[PDB]
Amino acid sequence: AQGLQPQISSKKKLMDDNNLSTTIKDLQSKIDEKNKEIDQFQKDYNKYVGLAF
Amino acid sequence: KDIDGLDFTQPKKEAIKQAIKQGAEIARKILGKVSEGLKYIDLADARM
Numbered sequence: 763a764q765g766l767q768p769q770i771s772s773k774k775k776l777m778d779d780n781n782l783s784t785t786i787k788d789l790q791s792k793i794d795e796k797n798k799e800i801d802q803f804q805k806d807y808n809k810y811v812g813l814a815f
Numbered sequence: 816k817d818i819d820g821l822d823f824t825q826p827k828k829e830a831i832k833q834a835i836k837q838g839a840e841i842a843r844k845i846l847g848k849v850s851e852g853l854k855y856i857d858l859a860d861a862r863m
Binding site for chain 1: 848849862
């Protein structure tokens with residue numbers, strides 16, 4: 763039988779080793795990256811429609 | 816210059832070509848804004 767005490771300590775070690783403090787910073791990098799494109803494409807659509815008239 | 820477009824062209828009211836003088840600069844400036852935006856096309860497609 764696998765021990766119940768290390769089976770808790772196995773999961774408790776897994777809960778400390780997690781990328782969750784990293785991937786959230788990684789995903790907020792990409793959202794702030796993709797917001798810069800969206801904030802740029804609004805400038806494009808407000809320019810081409812200006813050109814199209 | 817549009818008052819000046821009719822200041823310098825006062826005797827041309829009998830002339831049809833006064834409207835061509837009117838039609839001249841508008842036919843220029845419609846193209847100059849195209850090419851400025853056509854620069855903006857190649858400028859964006861690089862960035863794209």
